[PDB]
Design a protein around this ligand. Structure first.
Ligand code: PGW
Ligand code: PGW
Ligand code: PGW
Ligand code: PGW
Ligand code: PGW
Ligand code: PGW
Ligand code: CLR
Ligand code: CLR
Ligand code: NAG
Ligand code: NAG
Ligand code: NAG
Ligand code: NAG
Lengths: 236, 237, 198, 237, 62, 198
């Protein structure tokens, strides 16, 4: 998980570059650490591929699908000595295991805390993943427009775009100018209103129950207080 | 639920890979929801009866190591509850017969119905705990010897040993709290020896306080003989 | 006998590709083909160069340094009128629609460089190719008698292969989406019927 | 609530004012956006209400970062801080207030047991079309809130029937129904009750309360038993 | 020159300097144990309390 | 034995700085260093002045009065081509990237004043410094062989100290955030163990 975070940081570094460039051994120590991380990733879904009680069920769990659009393009990248900023943002989808690994370090010991970190993790992972997607769309162009209507957005400009979008603020200073980009923004507004009206709002309201008679008494000095118990009613 | 969870999940219980799954028709109240949210990987609740086969399958009763049936101590009719628990025993033993079931019985007379059920086997480890009989007997036996109930309660219950330094009664009290009861086959060097000699060798040389014994030879099954005389020798088994 | 969850998710994945094999075919039918077949409407003519002149009106191009520079130089304009064979009229040449839609008044937008003299020489070097070869060797030239009555293209916006990949790869996604569903049912039917051969 | 809202809003406006007056420091403070403080206040009010005109917006990277953090913080303390405290200031009861004394409209207060059955027959005869022109408005005072059938029946008569929640054993409720100005009060007794005498004594209690409030009044009441009728004669008024 | 930095430096050194003094005074008081402060909470301590009227007027004025 | 609320909020404040010591380090790694190390990629050359000329194309600067005035005057352009030592090519000088990105066609944007003659004299005064000292005293000059193949800078956008404060002050915030947590635990452990020395 920590090396997955490191690969995501490598993606964040590589998002400040053009579409591709030719390397041999070093340009920013770019692929040199990426190859090591991805070889460890290959070994990690290697030894749990043999741990599959169902060889098909492991193949379609989205926990190696994230580990699966990344590693063969890294092998092609080191076979060709050039980089590509493709579906590497899918590594951010592995942030869904953050509550699971944070439970291992004895930091969270509360079911409300586990559920809260699960919600924040699926929110941040979905948001960064979709931001990487529409970043990848907007760096390129509409291909029927021969890749000419490219919108040179930073990844983090695009992150700002999705936070302004999902909260229905919509400044319009930054927006998708490509047809495929507008199409994905339509789909993601519908998906965001889907999993806000169906995923969270019955789990948000599990973290909203409060009881209005609890706590203790503030011992104010000088105020002798009486505790009154027994049957208590408007009459008595 | 609280008393059972406390003894079962007591820290002194050390490493036990047993997860308690609770099946009850009534949904848990807020105090139950807090108590179930005090144990995550350890306690799961499910809604449903044990009188429906699908619910037994949902709780995986067949793979379950044992099923414990708890009877409300306070009820309008003791016999009615006892018959409900016997009904639950019949349902579980009809689903999967090779299972241990530990149950609570409010009345001593209602215990016979379990014996009437064919699958139930006492020797197989199926056991029925009669609350009325045990509580009254503990009170009774204590009428003979004042304070026996506390001694017997501190044996089986896992209770946390606390270091006390000051000369109080609690310091001498906790010297015997951490004792428990244990069942064990005797060694082969005790064959044909008298019970007082074996108790002397257990308490003198290796500080064990032996109470009772098994005894079976072609008669009815192996009774529990509390402190036999020198009249009865110790068998190999 | 029941569909297991490995089998069931393969069915859910297999239907997801059958649907998206239709939708990607359905999107590209008017998002890719609608600009394509309008470009394929203009036919190959065989036209001759009428006249090549200049105007004197500058037009502001935009060069760059590479690290996001917005340098804007200027280039002179050249109007290459040609004599069509089919619609036999006086019409301009255009390198593509991208040269046409940005500046229809010019025939050749040079790649914009920093110095104006660099952009000047790229004009006359292109102009020298059309001041020596006039009338002789009539070339293939694309013209539409529907949209642009007086504009002739030199190329297309696309290739012959632009009809291929819009029909191919959603149908490739469609067939593979079927082969997931078919091989799930067939292997299950071999795993539910051949088990009872006892 | 209004104080924490205004204080948070002005504080965050001052923060992003301070950010936007300066620039991004890696841009060597060159992308400064010369915002007034109150332009920035307008920006945050347009932002938090999710209106988002886009005429004014943060053009600095650190500014965009704080606007992301403050949109998340604003949706945090709107979904977690106020909306269970907003809904403490939202509870209203739909049967209270008093009766508008319209001049010329002699109103009747109807009390006693009130239900769809008892109320329907009286309303039908009183509001019958053949009754022609009668300026009498029936006002019903009952402790129990009306059921959905009662709500439909009361919403079949608008300028004619008003319900109010309250007893006739409290003087304030009698004042709310304007009993003193009321032409007459009709007390309806549930025909079906566990004890006839108990209900009869309750209706006599209601008579005593109304005649103690305002003695010069006509009261028409229902009595379940003939023997209980004498108590009304015993009342002096 | 642009001496904007000294203000924030002064406030933060007042914060974590004054925070460490409270921690180390609560360190050395419980480290020396290993090997007229009475009425001063009453001159102004009562005055700070909202119950005092002068105290309420002081809160309103500040 | 319990953490008191003064102790507990110090732990909550101490963790808040340990987290923000990471995040401020994490933000500035690609929000401060990513523009920084690209500027540190261009190396020190030792280049000679090739030629200093003018063009005649005006460029519209923007002066001000002080109380939000948008006065726009104009200034002539000067192209100072220099001969590099390392990449040995004909390339312009630029005062910084800010002079480069706004007007790459000029070498020196003067500070814009109201009168055009004021902006005119600031050009030729700068030009006189480069029309007398030509070829002699080859100066240090920054050039990148990756991004700008024909643009040479005179300065950097930043200093050597730009690597310091992006790594220093989040780590200063990180250590102080640790020292709050450590001294809370240690003083509590001296306040819970040394109390029982009775
Ligand atoms: C290019 C186009 C890309 C656009 C696609 C972006 C979204 C795809 C990913 C969306 C999120 C998918 C992942 C959603 C997901 O996994 O949900 C689940 C998490 O709960 P969890 O597993 O912990 O339950 C534990 C169990 O014990 C419940 O009791
Ligand atoms: C079911 C899903 C199906 C998806 C799979 C099908 C869809 C995906 C492939 C489409 C077919 C191949 C694309 C066409 C490739 C062939 C054409 C090609 O090579 O395009 C290049 C540009 O690429 C560009 O935009 C620049 C971007 C290069 C690719 C970067 C990644 C894009 C990933 C996008 C995702 C160069 O041309 P160029 O500029 O000179 O012309 C402008 C000039 O004429 C100016 O007038
Ligand atoms: C599927 C819809 C995609 C078809 C949209 C399309 O091709 O039209 C383009 C512009 O429209 C568009 O950008 C519309 C993009 C938004 C598509 C939203 C569809 C949601 C369903 C043409 O571009 P033009 O140069 O002709 O103008
Ligand atoms: C630069 C970055 C700056 C950005 C930071 C802006 C927000 C920070 C301040 C947010 C608000 C913090 C203050 C929030 C706060 O104090 O809440 C409390 C108020 O309730 P109160 O005390 O009365 O309860 C009385 C008790 O008796 C409850 O029973
Ligand atoms: C954990 C948190 C860590 C936060 C603490 C660390 C971050 C905060 C300090 C950064 C390091 C010091 C900043 C750099 C100071 C050294 C550099 C400096 O003095 O900058 C001045 C400008 O200031 C400016 O923007 C103008 C604003 C001055 C400061 C006003 C308050 C800003 C507070 C912002 C908050 C002058 O340069 P100048 O213009 O000539 O260059 C453009 C010229 O080259 C045109 O080409
Ligand atoms: C942490 C993210 C901050 C990194 C954002 C960043 O440095 O990119 C700048 C522009 O992007 C940005 O303004 C993005 C600002 C929005 C950041 C939103 C991040 C929310 C998480 C570069 O500026 P440019 O000149 O290269 O374009
Ligand atoms: C948020 C916290 C940690 C920041 C406060 C730390 C202060 C003490 C540090 C952070 C960066 C430092 C500044 C770095 C840049 C200039 C260099 C020079 O022109 C004079 C001093 C000056 C202005 C320094 C003064 C002290 C300084 C402001
Ligand atoms: C309340 C207490 C903590 C105040 C201490 C704050 C310190 C950090 C502040 C307040 C006074 C400040 C000084 C003000 C003026 C002097 C001389 C000037 O030419 C340069 C800066 C310099 C040298 C400053 C250094 C930082 C400074 C010493
Ligand atoms: C040249 O001219 C004719 C008539 O315009 C045209 O049809 C054809 O494209 C060219 N001829 C040949 C043989 O290609
Ligand atoms: C050439 O000249 C004119 C001008 O376009 C045109 O009308 C005529 O048809 C052309 N003749 C030939 C032979 O192409
Ligand atoms: C001047 O010239 C050389 C070669 O370009 C260069 O390496 C160096 O920076 C300068 N020489 C010295 C001694 O600084
Ligand atoms: C100077 O002249 C040319 C023009 O840039 C260049 O190719 C050559 O290398 C330079 N010579 C020296 C000695 O710098």
């Amino acid at each position: 998980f920590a090396l997955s975070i490191g690969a995501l940081v490598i993606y964040f570094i590589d998002s400040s570059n053009p579409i591709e460039s030719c390397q041999n051994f070093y340009k920013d120590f770019t692929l040199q650490i990426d190859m090591a991380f991805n070889v460890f990733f290959l070994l990690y879904f290697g030894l749990r591929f043999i741990a599959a009680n169902d060889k098909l069920w492991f193949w379609l769990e989205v926990n190696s699908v994230v580990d699966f659009f990344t590693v063969p393009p890294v092998f092609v990248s080191v076979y060709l000595n050039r980089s590509w900023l493709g579906l590497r943002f899918l590594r951010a989808l592995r942030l869904i295991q953050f509550s699971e690994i944070l439970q291992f370090l004895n930091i969270l010991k509360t079911s409300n805390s586990i559920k809260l970190v699960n919600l924040l993790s699926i929110f941040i992972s979905t948001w960064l993943t979709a931001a990487g997607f529409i970043h990848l769309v907007e760096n390129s162009g509409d291909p029927w427009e021969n890749f000419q209507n490219n919108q040179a957005l930073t990844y983090w400009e695009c992150v700002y775009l999705l936070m302004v979008t999902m909260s229905t603020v919509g400044y319009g200073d930054v927006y998708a100018k490509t047809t495929l980009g507008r199409l994905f923004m339509v789909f993601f507004i519908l998906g965001g209103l889907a999993m806000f009206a169906s995923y969270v709002p019955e789990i948000i309201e599990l973290i909203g129950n409060r009881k209005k008679y609890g706590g203790s008494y503030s011992a104010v000095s000088g105020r002798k207080h009486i505790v009154v118990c027994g049957h208590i009613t408007l009459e008595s | 639920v609280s008393n059972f969870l406390k003894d079962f999940l007591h820290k002194d219980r050390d490493d036990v890979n047993v997860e308690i799954v609770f099946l009850h028709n009534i949904s848990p109240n807020l105090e139950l929801e807090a108590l179930f949210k005090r144990h995550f990987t350890q306690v799961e609740f499910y809604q449903g009866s044990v009188l429906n086969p699908h619910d037994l399958a949902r709780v995986k009763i067949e793979s379950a190591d044992a099923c414990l049936i708890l009877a409300n101590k306070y009820c309008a009719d003791p016999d009615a509850e006892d018959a409900s628990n016997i009904m639950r025993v019949i349902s579980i033993k009809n689903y999967h017969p090779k299972i241990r079931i530990i149950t609570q019985m409010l009345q001593y007379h209602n215990k016979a119905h379990l014996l009437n059920i064919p699958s139930w086997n006492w020797k197989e480890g199926d056991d029925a705990i009669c609350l009325a009989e045990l509580k009254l007997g503990f009170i009774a036996q204590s009428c003979l010897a004042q304070g026996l109930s506390t001694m017997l309660a501190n044996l089986f219950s896992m209770r946390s040993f606390i270091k006390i330094e000051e000369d109080t009664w609690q310091k001498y009290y906790l010297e015997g709290v951490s004792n428990e009861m244990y069942t064990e086959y005797l060694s082969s060097a005790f064959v044909g020896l008298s019970f007082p000699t074996v108790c002397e060798l257990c308490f003198v040389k290796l500080k064990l306080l032996m109470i009772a014994i098994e005894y079976k030879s072609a008669n009815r099954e192996s009774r529990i003989l509390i402190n036999p005389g020198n009249h009865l020798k110790i068998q190999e088994g | 006998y029941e569909y297991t969850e490995a089998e069931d998710k393969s069915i859910r994945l297999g239907l997801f590709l059958i649907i998206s094999g239709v939708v990607s075919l359905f999107i590209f039918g008017f998002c890719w083909l609608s600009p394509a077949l309008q470009d394929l409407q203009a036919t190959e003519a065989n036209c001759t160069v009428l006249s090549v002149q200049q105007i004197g009106e500058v037009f502001e191009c935009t060069f760059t340094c590479g690290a996001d520079c917005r340098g804007t130089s200027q280039y002179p304009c050249v109007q290459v009128y040609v004599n069509n064979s089919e619609s036999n009229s006086r019409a301009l040449l255009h390198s593509d629609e991208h040269q046409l839609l940005t500046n229809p008044k010019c025939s050749y937008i040079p790649p914009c460089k920093r110095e104006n003299q660099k952009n000047l020489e790229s004009v006359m070097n292109w102009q020298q190719y059309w001041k020596d070869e006039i009338g002789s060797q009539p070339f293939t030239c694309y013209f539409n008698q529907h949209q642009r009555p007086d504009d002739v293209l030199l190329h297309r916006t696309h290739d012959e292969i632009v009809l291929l990949h819009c029909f191919l790869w959603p149908l490739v996604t469609f067939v593979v989406g079927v082969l997931i569903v078919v091989l799930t049912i067939c292997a299950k039917s071999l795993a539910v019927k051949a088990e009872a051969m006892k | 609530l209004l104080s924490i809202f205004i204080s948070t809003w002005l504080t965050a406006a001052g923060f992003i004012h301070l950010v936007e007056n300066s620039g991004d420091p890696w841009e060597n403070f060159q992308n400064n956006q010369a915002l007034t403080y109150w332009e920035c206040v307008y920006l945050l009010m347009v932002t938090m209400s999710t209106v988002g005109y886009g005429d004014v917006y943060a053009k600095t990277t650190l500014g965009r970062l704080f606007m992301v953090f403050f949109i998340l913080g604003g949706l945090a303390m709107f979904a977690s801080y106020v909306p269970e405290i907003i809904e403490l200031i939202g509870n209203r009861k739909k049967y209270g207030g008093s009766y508008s004394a319209v001049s010329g409209r002699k109103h009747i207060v109807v009390c006693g047991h009130i239900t769809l059955e008892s109320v329907s027959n009286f309303l039908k005869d009183f509001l019958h079309k053949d009754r022609d022109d009668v300026n009498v408005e029936i006002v019903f005072l009952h402790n129990i809130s009306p059921n959905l059938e009662l709500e439909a029946l009361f919403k079949r008569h608008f300028t004619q029937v008003e319900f109010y929640q309250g007893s006739v054993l409290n003087p304030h409720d009698l004042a709310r129904v304007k009993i003193e100005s009321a032409d007459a009060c009709l007390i309806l007794a549930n025909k079906y009750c566990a004890d006839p005498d108990a209900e009869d004594a309750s209706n006599i209690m209601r008579v005593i309360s109304i005649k103690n409030y305002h003695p010069k009044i006509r009261i028409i009441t229902q009595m379940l038993q003939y023997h209980n009728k004498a108590h009304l004669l015993n009342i002096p008024s | 020159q642009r001496m904007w930095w000294a203000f924030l430096a002064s406030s933060m050194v007042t914060f974590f300097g004054g925070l460490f003094i409270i921690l180390l005074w609560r360190t050395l008081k419980y480290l020396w144990t290993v090997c007229w402060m009475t009425s001063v909470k009453d001159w102004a301590g009562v005055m700070i309390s909202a119950q005092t009227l002068t105290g309420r007027v002081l809160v309103v004025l500040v």
